[PDB]
Swiss-Prot record, chains A, B:
Annotated residues for binding of Mn(2+) 1: 268, 272
Source lineage: Eukaryota, Viridiplantae, Streptophyta, Embryophyta, Tracheophyta
Annotated catalysed reactions: (2E)-geranyl diphosphate = (4R)-limonene + diphosphate
Cofactor(s) the record lists: Mg(2+); Mn(2+)
Matches recorded under Gene3D superfamilies: Farnesyl Diphosphate Synthase (1.10.600.10), Terpene synthase, N-terminal domain (1.50.10.130)
GO MF term set: (R)-limonene synthase activity; magnesium ion binding
GO CC field: chloroplast
EC number assigned by the record: 4.2.3.20
Localization (cell): Plastid, Chloroplast
Name of the protein described by the UniProt record: (R)-limonene synthase 1, chloroplastic
The entry's keywords: Chloroplast, Lyase, Magnesium, Manganese, Metal-binding, Plastid, Transit peptide
Amino acid sequence: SIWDHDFLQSLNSNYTDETYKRRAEELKGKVKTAIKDVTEPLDQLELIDNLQRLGLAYHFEPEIRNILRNIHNHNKENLYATSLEFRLLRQHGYPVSQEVFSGFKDDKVGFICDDFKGILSLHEASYYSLEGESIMEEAWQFTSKHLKEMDVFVAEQAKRALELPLHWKAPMLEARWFIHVYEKREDKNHLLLELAKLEFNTLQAIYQEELKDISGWWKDTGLGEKLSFARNRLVASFLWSMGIAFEPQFAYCRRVLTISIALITVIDDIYDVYGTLDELEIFTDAVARWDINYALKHLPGYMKMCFLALYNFVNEFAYYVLKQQDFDMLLSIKHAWLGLIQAYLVEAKWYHSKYTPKLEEYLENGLVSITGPLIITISYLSGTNPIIKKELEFLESNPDIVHWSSKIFRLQDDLGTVPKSIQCYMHETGASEEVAREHIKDMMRQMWKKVNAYTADKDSPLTRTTAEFLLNLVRMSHFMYLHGDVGFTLLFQPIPL
Amino acid sequence: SIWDHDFLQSLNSNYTDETYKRRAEELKGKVKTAIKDVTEPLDQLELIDNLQRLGLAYHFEPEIRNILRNIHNHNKENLYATSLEFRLLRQHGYPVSQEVFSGFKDDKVGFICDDFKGILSLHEASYYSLEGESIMEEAWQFTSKHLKEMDVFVAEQAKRALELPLHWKAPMLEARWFIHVYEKREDKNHLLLELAKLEFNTLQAIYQEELKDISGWWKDTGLGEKLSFARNRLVASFLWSMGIAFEPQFAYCRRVLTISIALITVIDDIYDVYGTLDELEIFTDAVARWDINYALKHLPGYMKMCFLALYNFVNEFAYYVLKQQDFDMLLSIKHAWLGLIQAYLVEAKWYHSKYTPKLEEYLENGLVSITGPLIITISYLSGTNPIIKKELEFLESNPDIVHWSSKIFRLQDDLGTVPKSIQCYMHETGASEEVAREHIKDMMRQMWKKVNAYTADKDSPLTRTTAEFLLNLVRMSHFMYLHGDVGFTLLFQPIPL
Ligand SMILES: C=C[C@@](C)(CCC=C(CF)CF)OP(=O)(O)OP(=O)(O)O
Ligand SMILES: C=C[C@@](C)(CCC=C(CF)CF)OP(=O)(O)OP(=O)(O)O
Ligand SMILES: [Mn+2]
Ligand SMILES: [Mn+2]
Ligand SMILES: [Mn+2]
Ligand SMILES: [Mn+2]
Ligand SMILES: [Mn+2]
Ligand SMILES: [Mn+2]
């Protein structure tokens, strides 16, 4: 908790200034010209891979779209080239058959390859597998096992792919690591690299300015002073919101998300630590009524400021959207908050009854209590303009993509550890904790196949942009499972020059 | 409406800096030493008069208290000296008999005096008259008539006393005018004057900083953009709150008051101009319920943001006091807001029925609709720490001092002009508008006698500090009746050197 309010207010990055924003525009135009001159399809695919991994892809969206749309129209015997095209096309919603890998797979003896580069790209592409694509499953089985066996760069490349594949990491999180790798490359575009370093440093400056604003708001509520367990988690919460929506236009989305996660953290500590069962029933009822007079009349003292802070914050949230685009979402947003709170009470009742639920019964409640349903609702209302009534109702209908994404989120948090996923699974199968962890890791990978189908469904009310919020939340949980300061490195540490 | 958000943000007074605050402390100590050396009672009384009229009296409260407490223990044939002592002692709550003026009053022919200086001081003292003190009433009759008959400074002195006596003006409003008069004085204390100019300029800097903060809050709600009739009245509202509570420690009181008055102004325009009767019944009901879900469900579109802005603002107000001193005042503050709103609906129903009420029936509703009861409640909750439960309940009991102060406030606003006080009185007595205005001015002076009694009552739950909020609000209405830019001169125009 070193990065308190005073530290945040004292930051003064140079990259907020106007000179850098001029140079970035100059570089963007110069880069767009260089993209034109890449015409060979493999160079086109390697360019997109580099652009996405440098955190620059959102500047060149139509340019990337042309390249992929063109390659799809024309659609090797190269495993690297086949796997890279497969990954990129599936990532951006195009249909590619799993049968493109059939040439490298022998029916009797399985996959045949010795090239690490082709194996690494196939491993990345395997996470874009759909449900029931047995070639891709065997491809993952073959690639993971080969990668586990493992020149210094090959060892690190193999290590990173095993702990976190590209499909499971948000764009900006890998940006700093990949920026160095790109400057070590001999065939690097020098202007492309200079832009990657410049935009990365400018984003930090933007985030730091937002943190000052959010830091002052948190100080004004004074929950940290009132509640000794309300440790300042502001920077950690912003890290999550930043991974959910990193683009500069999503500043209001990151603000609502950061504050929401900070409040969620305090309320969660009240339910699964500090609150008695009778107190938790009153707080749940007060949230359900959404009546400030009732809450002040019946809540315990320590719960009052916590409820009122949440109450006013959400009502201000409803006011902001009402002013901005004349949309009333108060019923929706407080409904989602109640769902989270009710799932907390279910977990508290289980704990006091000493009831160990079956894993599936736990996951049914656990997918809501991990805030997946609430967070995607917050992200949609605070990050979309105009709000579409059809699209919001689809989220309120408990859709399948939210169902399975939240399950991965819940399973991933429990791996970092009331009884949770690991204890439920051990109790249910008799497996050891070590084995139980491996099976839970596998469930997440199998559930990502279900999620891949819903992303490709273009008949769903959810846009791809709305779906990215949900995936990035899940991706953020994968990332935070590896790292407990990387968050300090992401927000407060510029890249030199 | 020249002083918009952009003008307020661009101000950068030099007097916020630390050097001036050093010199002020040096001057305060040097002045306290000079006060010791004044020992003659008339010089002691003239010193207090100068200190109060320079806006410096709150720095030397115990020093003034000693002087008055000492003079009361020892308690001329000088009308000026008798009238000045009478005014100052009654102003600060000491008992002085009206019989101190009996020497200058002949039973058959009335008051005997030719000295303008003694007449001017008696005129000021006459406003501290109590109910039924026939000497003081005759003193006012004699002094006002003599003053009406009216060397350039005597004419201005006589003019100012007739339009606004000392008892009816807030301290800082007269400060700039009196500061010049004091520097023209030959026997001036030079350090006393330098302090008066310095504190006046420092207060402007403090107010300007508060205005920036309040200006940004008003911009964020966006009511001025939503409602074409919601003209920016922020600077005008702050002027009122500043006259209600000018001291630097009352920054939060001025903030809540300014925003409250800004919201009152918009809501008042909705009731007595723009809203239909059915719409006003829903808004009144929504305020009575204090239910955000109901309001969004049933209110017209244009009323929604106006209600929600008020709703969140008051709930944040309740939150701030709860965090600060663990006091719950939500029931009280929303009760006072409902009383104002209900009085608005009464006036709207009268207007649509074309019913001209009797003046007393109008004043019964009019004293609430002028916001007197609400404003004193806001001032107490936002300007007192700790809040006393006994003292608040006394305000909620509709006490007499609030009853008569609000009546003066209501009568004074109607003089600046649905049918109001002047039309009701004309309709009721057949008097002409010119005569009706004179009678209404007299009512206010007779009602100030009732208010003087309640101020002197030391058995009331209200402290003198709480009573000053109420009187300063009334005093502010007297001041704003004379001036429609004096408000610009008060806040944005420093005194040189
Ligand atoms: C300790 C924090 C949490 C709450 C996760 C924090 C990240 C969030 C992103 F949205 C919360 F919104 O883990 P947690 O174990 O305390 O949550 P849990 O009690 O249900 O298991
Ligand atoms: C035009 C403004 C008001 C409202 C007075 C503004 C000053 C205030 C100090 F507290 C309001 F809070 O006069 P007004 O004639 O419009 O009020 P009215 O309709 O009841 O007669
Ligand atoms: Mn927890
Ligand atoms: Mn929990
Ligand atoms: Mn957990
Ligand atoms: Mn009006
Ligand atoms: Mn009115
Ligand atoms: Mn009026």
